[PDB]
Design a protein around this ligand. Structure first.
Ligand SMILES: *[C@@H]1O[C@H](CO)[C@@H](O[C@@H]2O[C@H](CO)[C@@H](O[C@@H]3O[C@H](CO[C@H]4O[C@H](CO)[C@@H](O)[C@H](O[C@H]5O[C@H](CO)[C@@H](O)[C@H](O)[C@@H]5O[C@H]5O[C@H](CO)[C@@H](O)[C@H](O)[C@@H]5O)[C@@H]4O)[C@@H](O)[C@H](O[C@H]4O[C@H](CO)[C@@H](O)[C@H](O)[C@@H]4O[C@H]4O[C@H](CO)[C@@H](O)[C@H](O)[C@@H]4O)[C@@H]3O)[C@H](O)[C@H]2NC(C)=O)[C@H](O)[C@H]1NC(C)=O
Ligand SMILES: Cc1cc(-c2n[nH]c(=O)n2C)c(C(C)C)cc1Cl
Ligand SMILES: Cc1cc(-c2n[nH]c(=O)n2C)c(C(C)C)cc1Cl
Ligand SMILES: [Ca+2]
Ligand SMILES: [Ca+2]
Ligand SMILES: [Cl-]
Ligand SMILES: [K+]
Ligand code: NA
Ligand SMILES: [Zn+2]
Length: 806
């Protein structure tokens, strides 16, 4: 209950929230059924509209008007935004030439340039080019400020997950808003778009920008507008807040538009009805910029124009029905649409089996437009697993499609022609970023980046220390003229050992054999040098990775590769090798097929053994440095060292072999040489972070050899591909992957065919950022380059998406 018979007199859009049963006058009282009786009358005025006209100029103030054209309006801070244009002969902001903003040009008493976040729902990245003719204000912001060709949202590419990721710098798995609908089993409560529950604070984890600001003495406008409050009134409210006294005035503001998303759902992303929504959003940007110009703030405020996700063509007839695959379709609860999430309808059902549900949805129709996953098997780049609110069974839905439980759900819930929520690398899901103001660069294009990075930057813009988040602070320093954050490289925690020859062959009882006894100061001195690291500059191009946790490991040098060998996990943490464009692929000689050789640098006690692999009928093995890429028949012997071996399911060996035998050479040909770093990853609790030894759930049978959940490779070359990877004078180019180490190839419906028809497709799906691999390994790469650290941070955040051009 709220006693709503108090008044909003002088309280319209008050910044501090009053506690019930006192009536509220803040911009979210509507959503709480808590506004004072006179909120509409006083705070939602509309009389005479939103624009000054010639006849209204110099009028006598009438307090009933929506906005004012009287002489006193500027000092009262409540002119219509076009006041100076119509009444004072001024030009619209959009009609003025852009001029570099080298320093903040602010009124006396402004302690820092304000930040205004202008968020637009469903604003697809290609609208910038395709709607450019009807968006002159936005187009001016874009060309004169700092812009990216697109900005990558988070998965799922829905509204709240993305807006709250903007506010926190966190993955949805961490902030807790994992979809537009959720069930939380601990709370035993559900979150929905409609309803009051979404306003309960227990859903919203992390620390959003307004809280970060408040705790550090920076005041914030509200980050919620009631849907029925018109956009003109939202703008006038922000402009009114900017006229407050210094001690009362916020430094950070948010505007939000429900468009173009709203129309996009109805008409599709490029429906002819879409021109009007884009026109109208532009006009709002115009009103803001004119209003700022009036208040002498258009060269003071930093403006961020940002979308939450894009929009795809999706219609009712492109729906897959779970009723066409499952027999027990009524024992499941499905969160439907552009993604699927499945759980048991009742916890009291002991006959519910996720394994039989997955199997029944796997590769069952020729052109099947979704793929089932246990959430821990989803591409790691999605970071979509570590939350009790994400159901164990997930369906990745093809772009342009829906999934639903039964056909009756679709006609008794065609209306809609647009939707979104798909995989966040899908081009149609990409959205926008422009930054304009004294703190952003002038007329600058930056590479596409992920929305998880903006929180740090907004903190930088406001002089705030960001809460712990998933951005990489410094990766976006190139967006900024000033206020850059100067990060330092993390300190190495564990220094390596450099073992020499310390064990005789006969001390090993590993059950390994090799035909290598087939036996000169020419090549005996030469092989000594290779084992001491004479080739290390060729194969370790960017310095050795740093180990950022406490562990025991050895550097091992070889002619063709270098590794950091973990005595704890009994395998390399990393293996580094360079393959030039001229390099030759050879095969494993017949006499060396099953060869594994003890490493006389590493004790039997800290080695793997061949018997374990023989005994384990499921688990086989592979090699991190590929024998196929040996520089000579003699060097090849090095690749069969027990210290280069890793556990691999036969199913996975098909993938790995094709990558090593075919794709490495192909990349070296295309990229003019590549440096490769490969290794294992253990993430049994699917939290995106390196497992400790006590978190491992699977070992090679009868041994302490742990089984990786994934294999990574980081593949680096020169951005200027006219220079070979090993002689690159400038910027680097990278692509990486984190392949799941699975005992079947069920993920790939065409795996019964030759690896040339399915493997690369799998690898692209599991593309990754270096940073993703960093989290998962506790390693820090690119320690020794000729490049600035911020440029290297940008490199580490890069995701090779394999999509076509935007
Ligand atoms: C992306 O960036 C984020 C942010 O930096 C990274 O997430 C952080 O990672 C840390 C490492 O996992 C984690 O630290 C833990 O915090 C525990 C206390 O957490 C509370 O307090 C913090 C700080 O205010 C708060 O942010 C947390 O909020 C979480 O939980 C609430 C609900 O309870 C949600 O509203 C919110 O969304 C958030 O949930 C998310 O994180 C939790 C994990 O905390 C997940 O469970 C959720 O699914 C969701 O993703 C909390 O309110 C602290 O108690 C932990 O310490 C225990 O565990 C460690 C083991 O490493 C051990 O060393 C300690 O001794 C201690 O052990 C004891 O408890 C164990 C478990 O109960 C038990 O097994 C032991 O036997 C002991 O009894 C730990 O320090 C930090 O909380 C999160 N922060 C956030 C916001 O998510 C994230 O890793 C990044 N991702 C990537 C890929 O890089
Ligand atoms: C849906 C919604 C919820 C909340 C919200 N309510 N409680 C909470 O922690 N949050 C984050 C907010 C903030 C700005 C008040 C805005 C919106 Cl659009
Ligand atoms: C920019 C932005 C807008 C909104 C937002 N959502 N709805 C609304 O009116 N606003 C203002 C939110 C909510 C989800 C906390 C967060 C951010 Cl970073
Ligand atoms: Ca949205
Ligand atoms: Ca882990
Ligand atoms: Cl959802
Ligand atoms: K075996
Ligand atoms: Na298959
Ligand atoms: Zn939408």
């Amino acid at each position: 209950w709220t006693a709503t018979s108090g008044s909003c007199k002088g309280r319209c859009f008050e910044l501090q929230e009053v506690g019930p049963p006192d009536c509220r006058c803040d911009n979210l009282c509507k959503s709480y059924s808590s506004c004072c009786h006179d909120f509409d009358e006083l705070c939602l005025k509309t009389a005479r509209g939103w624009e000054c006209t010639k006849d209204r100029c110099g009028e006598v103030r009438n307090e009933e008007n929506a906005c004012h054209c009287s002489e006193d309006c500027l000092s009262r801070g409540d002119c219509c935004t076009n006041y100076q244009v119509v009444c004072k002969g001024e030009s619209h902001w959009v009609d003025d030439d852009c001029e570099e903003i080298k320093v903040p040009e602010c009124p006396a008493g402004f302690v820092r340039p304000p930040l205004i976040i202008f968020s637009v729902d469903g604003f697809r990245a290609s609208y910038m080019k395709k709607g450019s003719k009807v968006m002159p204000n936005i187009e001016k912001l874009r060309s004169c400020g700092t812009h990216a060709p697109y900005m990558r949202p988070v998965y799922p590419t829905k509204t709240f997950p993305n807006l709250y990721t903007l506010a926190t710098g966190l993955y949805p798995e961490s902030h807790g808003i994992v979809g537009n609908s959720m069930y939380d089993p601990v709370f035993d409560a559900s979150f929905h778009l409609r309803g009051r529950e979404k306003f309960n604070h227990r859903w919203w984890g992390g620390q959003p920008l307004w809280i970060t600001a408040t705790k550090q003495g920076v005041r914030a406008g509200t980050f919620f507008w009631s849907v029925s409050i018109p956009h003109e009134r939202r703008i006038l409210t922000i402009l009114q807040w900017l006229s407050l006294p210094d001690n009362e005035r916020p430094s950070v503001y948010a505007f939000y538009s429900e468009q173009p998303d709203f129309s996009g759902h109805k008409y599709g992303p490029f429906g002819p009805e879409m021109t009007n929504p884009l026109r109208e959003i532009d006009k709002t940007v115009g009103q803001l910029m004119d209003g700022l110009k009036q208040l002498r703030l258009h060269r003071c405020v930093n403006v961020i124009f940002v979308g939450d996700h894009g929009m795809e063509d999706v219609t009712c007839d492109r729906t897959e029905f779970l009723s066409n695959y499952l027999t027990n379709v009524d024992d499941i609860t499905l969160v439907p649409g552009t993604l699927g999430r499945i759980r048991a309808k009742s916890i009291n059902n002991s006959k519910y089996d996720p394994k039989t549900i997955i199997a029944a949805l796997t590769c069952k129709k020729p052109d099947q437009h979704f793929k089932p996953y246990m959430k821990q098997h989803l591409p790691k780049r999605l970071h979509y697993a570590n939350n009790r609110r994400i159901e164990d069974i997930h369906l990745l839905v093809d772009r342009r499609w829906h999934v639903a439980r039964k056909p009756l759900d679709v006609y008794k819930k065609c209306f809609f022609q647009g939707d979104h929520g798909f995989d966040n690398k899908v081009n149609s899901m990409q959205t926008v970023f422009v930054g304009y103001g004294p703190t952003f660069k002038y007329r600058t294009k930056v590479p596409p980046f992920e929305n998880i990075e903006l929180y740090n930057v907004m903190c930088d813009l406001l002089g705030l220390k960001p809460a712990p988040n998933n951005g990489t602070h410094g990766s976006l320093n190139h967006l900024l003229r000033t206020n850059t954050f100067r990060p330092t490289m993390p300190d190495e925690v564990s220094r390596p050992n450099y073992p020499g020859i310390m064990y005789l062959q006969s001390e090993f009882d590993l059950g390994c054999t090799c035909d290598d006894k087939v036996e000169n100061k020419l090549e005996e001195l030469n092989k000594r040098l290779h084992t001491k690291g004479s080739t290390k500059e060729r194969h370790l191009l960017y310095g050795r990775p740093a180990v950022l946790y406490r562990t025991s490991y050895d550097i091992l040098y070889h002619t063709d590769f270098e590794s950091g060998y973990s005595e704890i996990f009994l395998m390399p943490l990393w293996t580094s090798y360079t393959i030039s464009k001229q390099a030759e692929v050879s095969s494993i000689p017949e006499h060396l097929t099953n060869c594994v050789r003890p490493d006389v640098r590493v004790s039997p006690g800290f080695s793997q053994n061949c018997l374990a692999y023989k005994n384990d009928k499921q688990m086989s093995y592979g090699f991190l440095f590929p024998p196929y890429l040996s520089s000579s028949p003699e060097a090849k012997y090095d690749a069969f060292l027990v210290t280069n071996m890793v556990p691999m399911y036969p199913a996975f060996k098909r993938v790995w072999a094709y990558f090593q035998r075919v794709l490495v050479k192909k990349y070296a040909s295309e990229r003019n040489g590549v440096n490769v770093i490969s290794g294992p990853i253990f993430d049994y609790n699917y939290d995106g972070l390196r497992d400790t030894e006590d978190e491992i759930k699977q070992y090679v049978e009868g041994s302490s050899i742990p089984v990786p959940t994934h294999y990574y490779s980081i593949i680096t070359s020169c951005l200027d591909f006219t220079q070979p990877a090993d002689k690159c004078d400038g910027p680097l180019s990278v692509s990486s992957f984190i392949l799941p180490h699975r005992p079947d190839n069920d993920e790939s419906c065409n795996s019964s065919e030759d690896e040339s028809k399915w493997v690369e497709e799998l690898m692209k799906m599991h593309t990754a950022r270096v940073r993703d691999i960093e989290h998962l390994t506790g390693l820090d790469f690119y320690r020794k380059t000729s490049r600035s650290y911020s440029e290297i941070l940008t490199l580490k955040t890069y995701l090779h998406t394999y999509e076509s051009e935007i």
